[PDB]
Symmetry: D2
Subunit: 259 residues, 4 copies
């Protein structure tokens, strides 16, 4: 059991990737705390995961709420070993820089950058008390390669990537590891961008398809585990080599096939 006995918190737990992750971590022996906003079916989520899974509301914009979540984990299990900072805000008016408003921008940084920082701020000493532990932060390929939307979101993911290196560095000596995952496109309900945009993206993933939630859950599980004890402060792409190839490859292939 790769995570035998560890206590894990997953944020954004009612989301596509968040639910599946909680599942995989439970399946590997962890006692999972599912966390998400009050409006969501946390209870249905936890019931579905099973394996002793519990749940508690969290609002990353609220330092006291972020703190209440960790303190609840400690009330319930007496310890904390693992945290998947998976939650993320993405406003649909997050388009072009010239079109950016301060509200869309600030809402997105408050949840994503500040909130993840707060989660680390209060998780870390618990990890240290436990004898060491693991934080996995979810970033995104969008931090590394741009397009005509998600400017705020993208930039917050970049902040989180640097935040990963700071946690890893400052707390390595106390036995805490921190890594980040930059996923490519993953089939979620927050997807189900229109179909022909998805089809376009799909051709540029080297498997020829978008990812499935469990393919991110499996890297979270691994990075959260002792098998990764010499892996820290890294950003690891789970994106089917989206950025490993020259752009224009699919149409160069079609072109070569003609000529």
């Amino acid at each position: 059991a790769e995570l035998e006995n560890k206590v894990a918190i997953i944020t954004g737990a009612c989301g596509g990737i968040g639910l599946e992750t909680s599942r995989v971590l439970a399946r590997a022996g962890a006692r999972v705390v599912l966390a998400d906003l009050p409006e969501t079916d946390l209870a249905g989520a936890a019931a579905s995961v099973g394996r002793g899974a519990v749940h508690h509301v969290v609002d990353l914009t609220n330092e006291v709420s972020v703190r209440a979540l960790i303190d609840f984990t400690i009330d319930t299990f007496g310890r904390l070993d693992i945290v998947d900072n998976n939650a993320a805000h993405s406003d649909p008016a997050d388009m072009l820089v010239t079109q950016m408003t301060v509200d869309v921008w600030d809402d997105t940084f408050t949840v994503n950058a500040r909130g993840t920082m707060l989660m680390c701020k209060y998780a870390i000493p618990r990890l240290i008390s436990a004898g060491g532990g693991a934080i996995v932060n979810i970033s995104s390929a969008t931090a590394h390669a741009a397009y005509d939307m998600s400017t705020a979101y993208a930039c917050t993911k970049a902040a989180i990537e640097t935040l990963t290196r700071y946690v890893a560095t400052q707390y390595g000596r106390h036995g805490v590891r921190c890594n980040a995952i930059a996923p490519g496109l993953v089939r979620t309900p927050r997807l189900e961008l229109p179909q022909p945009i998805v089809d376009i993206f799909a051709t540029h993933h080297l498997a020829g398809r978008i990812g499935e939630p469990h393919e991110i859950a499996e890297l979270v599980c691994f990075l959260a585990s002792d098998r990764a004890a010499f892996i820290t402060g890294q950003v690891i792409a789970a994106d089917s080599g989206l950025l490993a190839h020259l752009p224009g490859l699919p149409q160069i292939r079609a072109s070569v096939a003609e000529l």
Copy 2:
């Protein structure tokens, strides 16, 4: 001359690097506008720069003030070709993740991340009307490699690096280039009061030239990246850090042990 007849905004112009960037840009032929907080001596900086350099106050935390800066420039010169987003907030209580307060975090993100974004928001329309132009955003080595201080600062610079890519991708078809510089340690008045000498000296050893940087050595890179010589360089993050991060840690101790 490299920037003949170009109109340039330098924010943080009273600072070590910004004042010096102002000199090199104006020495390379630019009509420069020096901008910084109202309690700074903008009059004196513009005087010391000469060559028809002007000055206008700006408060990056305030969109009105950003709007007012860009418009002053257009009222005065009728065009805008270059922006150097050089201003940066850096709080002395900006220490460890676990010690972070939301006030230190937001102050920093409001000036650095949001402010730079607001500067790009209003400058881009004008640069397009020039028939293309350049934006240089200052980042920092610290975004890429961590230590026990400047976490918030570090994370905001990460954000500006992604922003830079988004600005390049979005407005390349309209003749706008955007690049970021990532300085190593650079000798400024901020620096002398931030770090004590023994630690500065330690850092100096990990720069391959065996010394820390001088402001003008960052200014020249700004100048090249803002100039038409960089016509085919856009969306990059370029380190001016004496290969601070190009060598294995422990090199000087390895070398000392070899002697």
Copy 3:
């Protein structure tokens, strides 16, 4: 069983990292083929791994020999799923750029760059015939950060990092993944000048050098269906060696003084 039913080839299988990667993969349920030079004790390494591990010589400088290894695996087990390109030549005359001899450079490139390419050249069509599979290439942190020795070696690992992307790019459509691992300092016999080893140890964030098993686990993960959506990557198993500013320990000691 993370790799139940898979056939794997490990090169440099008698080495510290290669042997201990062989155990782990075998423990995961893979049928493993240990490959190394004829003067190494392959049978004893295969014995120590057990679990049906077999062995066969290979000289990575020689194309015929690489072919013979792939063909041996295929004729034995009827398939191939995993290749850990772990073998590496590391010459002790490999010092500074201005002292470099063509012999040391070429010797190092022939085994590491050309050799890794030849293993891929002939594994790829087989992995394709198996429905798809994974290749893992061992790089080195030294490719991204220089010092006063190992110049040829680091340069060959960079070439390997590029090879990895090409393999992953060219053959992704046909079911083949390829990823690279860049280790920090790991404890082996080849390793064992102590004063240098402890200096390096302070700059790994665990404050120690790596263990071979800690590289093995990552090869294992990357060779498995759990990594189905990871490909073309270079991943650091270096305890954050390059995620922090250099000078950190010395800064921390100065801060413990003042």
Copy 4:
């Protein structure tokens, strides 16, 4: 001017990027030495550059020849300040991994990786005698982003980026800078005989300025990194590729689609 009184060796000096980098370095005040294989027209290239440019044959595959080029420069000029390792072999048989031959591979690595190490090996001591100096190594976008051809070429370039980091680290202390430039598609005579047009047009749309580069846009970046304006830039790999690798792959067709949607 930016390289006043500085002595510069440029390899591959008859090729599109080489010849144009020679002119620019020379326009910037450098005493330039054009170096390329004996079957190229070095005399014509130096006549084109003017400004006192000289020429001399080199074969990167021959250690005795690399040394002879460095010894010639010192004989003529008494010093060496700048080397632009621009020469690269690039073989049309260099297609896919599964199709790679040992000869295509070895020929490419002997010229590109080994050749460039030998240039530095013989140049660096002279850069140190002159009180410090600058090396600029030419790489390629293709070491970072893979496609269906030029595997070997691309791996040698990767080797050269790490090599750059090793020169920079080993000789920083003695006053020697070393950087690399990774170009995107640049209009040269070789792309006119290398890739067909409809493939050039596809690549062109993925470069953010909506076109392939010109050789001078590379030359200017070489010029700057060779000069004392770059004194605190060392060990880097800088892309002059109009952000070919800063955007999501598929952007142009996503834009085509979003306009129809």
